[PDB]
A paper describes a structure:
RNA interference by type III CRISPR systems results in the synthesis of cyclic oligoadenylate (cOA) second messengers, which are known to bind and regulate various CARF domain–containing nuclease receptors. The CARF domain–containing Csa3 family of transcriptional factors associated with the DNA-targeting type I CRISPR systems regulate expression of various CRISPR and DNA repair genes in many prokaryotes. An atomic structure of the apo form of a Csa3a homolog from S. solfataricus (Csa3Sso) has been previously reported to harbor an N-terminal CARF and a C-terminal MarR-like winged helix-turn-helix (wHTH) domain. Here, we identify cA4 as the cognate ligand of Csa3Sso and show that Csa3Sso lacks ring nuclease activity in vitro.
To better understand the structural basis for Csa3Sso ligand specificity, we determined a 2.05-Å X-ray crystal structure of His6-Csa3Sso bound to cA4. Like the apo Csa3Sso structure, the Csa3Sso dimer is domain swapped with respect to an N-terminal CARF and the C-terminal wHTH DNA-binding domains of the two protomers A and B. Overall, these data evidence monodisperse dimers of Csa3Sso in solution that persist in the presence and absence of cA4. Consistent with in-solution dimers observed for Csa3Sso, the asymmetric unit for the Csa3Sso•cA4 complex structure consisted of a dimer of Csa3Sso bound to one molecule of cA4.Figure 3 cA4-bound Csa3Ssois a dimer in solution. Comparison of all the cA4-bound structures of CARF domain proteins revealed that cA4 in the Csa3Sso–cA4 complex structure exists in a unique elongated conformation. In this conformation, P1a and P1b (called distal phosphoryl groups) in the cA4 ring are stretched outward (with a P-to-P distance of 11.8 Å), which brings P2a and P2b (called proximal phosphoryl groups) to a shorter P-to-P distance of 4.4 Å. The hallmark of all the adenine-binding pockets in Csa3Sso are π-stacking interactions of Phe14A&B and Phe10A&B with the nonplanar (A1a and A1b) and planar (A2a and A2b) adenine rings, respectively. The inward-facing phosphoryl group in the middle of the elongated cA4 (P2b) was found to hydrogen bond with highly conserved Arg98A&B (cA4 binding motif 2) and Glu122A (β5–α5 loop) residues in Csa3Sso. Of interest, the cA4 phosphoryl interacting surface of the Csa3Sso pocket is largely positively charged except for the conserved Glu122 residue that hydrogen bonds with cA4 central phosphoryl (P2b) oxygen via its side-chain carboxyl in the protomer A. Such interactions of Glu122 side chains could create an electrostatic repulsion with central phosphoryls (P2a and P2b) likely constraining them close to each other in the elongated cA4 conformation. Also, the active site interactions of Arg98 and Glu122 with the target cA4 phosphoryl (P2b) results in an O’-P’-O” angle of 94° presenting with a stereochemistry inconducive for nucleophilic attack by the 2′ ribosyl hydroxyl.
Numbering used by the authors:
A (entry chain A): 1 to 191, 196 to 212
B (entry chain B): 1 to 211, 213
The structure:
Amino acid sequence: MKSYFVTMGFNETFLLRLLNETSAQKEDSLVIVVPSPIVSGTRAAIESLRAQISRLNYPPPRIYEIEITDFNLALSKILDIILTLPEPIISDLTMGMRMINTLILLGIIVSRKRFTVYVRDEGGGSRVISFNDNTIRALMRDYSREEMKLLNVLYETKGTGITELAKMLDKSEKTLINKIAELKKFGILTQRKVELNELGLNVIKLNK
Amino acid sequence: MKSYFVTMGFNETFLLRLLNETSAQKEDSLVIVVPSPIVSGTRAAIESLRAQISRLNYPPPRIYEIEITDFNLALSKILDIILTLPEPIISDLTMGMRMINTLILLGIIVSRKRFTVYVRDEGGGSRVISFNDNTIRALMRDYSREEMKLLNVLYETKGTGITELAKMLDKSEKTLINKIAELKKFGILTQKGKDRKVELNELGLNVIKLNK
RNA sequence: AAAA
């Protein structure tokens, strides 16, 4: 099971593409936040979506309409929704008002729940970026000086095997293997040569 | 001095509004990052922004272009720019590609720099909302056991006086008054009502949602 | 939907 958590603009096909591409199930949660009042273009898009859910075996969407007066009051309503959603939360920030998308994104990040976010080229095509809760945790984690010395050696060597890495770092092979396991769980390196990935390069840039 | 860090679409209007709202000075840094190659509509928006800036003692913009291949490669480009920026950073996420704005927002957050974000109604309305690095700090702060007790009692009472709070938490009035002064300044507490009850403010009500 |  899955949740979808989006805000609707005037174009339901962004969401239909998301539901189709991530194999939406009838039993998933589909929650759509809209501003108050719901304007004519948004109502048409939601009603068009509703006219497809039976044919496509999708859940009926649950619409939340929210007044936006300031950041914190609106974030409270978004957080209330988020904290009830089954995980993972699937989000696609390509659709709907930027104010609400900003709330959704900050909300899912500070909630610490599991999520995947997509952001695409609005005008279509192939450009797309994506990230998840593990991406954000890795970038926001506090790294010890010993961890940073490990990562910085990997940055300099562009990859080293465990045996040679242990000798270079003056670490037990047993204790280095445990740290490598702890760090790959954050998704910042790969492996019997250990190597940084792109996310690990960003970690190094933040802790320089 | 402060810095402005935005992207740009086909319209300079929202950025000019932000510069007015946030008291832009000619010595501020204005940095604009755009997708490569710079398309015609964006070039026209930048040229129109420059002409308007020259009237108004605003900071002249420095332009960066980036390729967007994937999240981490593009974030590295954004981080490189961010680390050149004097603090605090001001951004408005209502202009330009959503992909770039998402990277700007995530970049300034994980850079741990001081920043303020504005984002506005883009479809005809007038509402603008705002948050800053202290917003994120307050929501993700590791509150102590004693701090959590205080925050939860305030939530459960919907606000109460210092004297009552000190009894419920088994503390002296003096030490509680000092903690409450600290968290008012930090920005999560207020003393509403005519009876001087202490309560969570709008930000504190979000903090408590993430902390029991 | 680079101003839902």
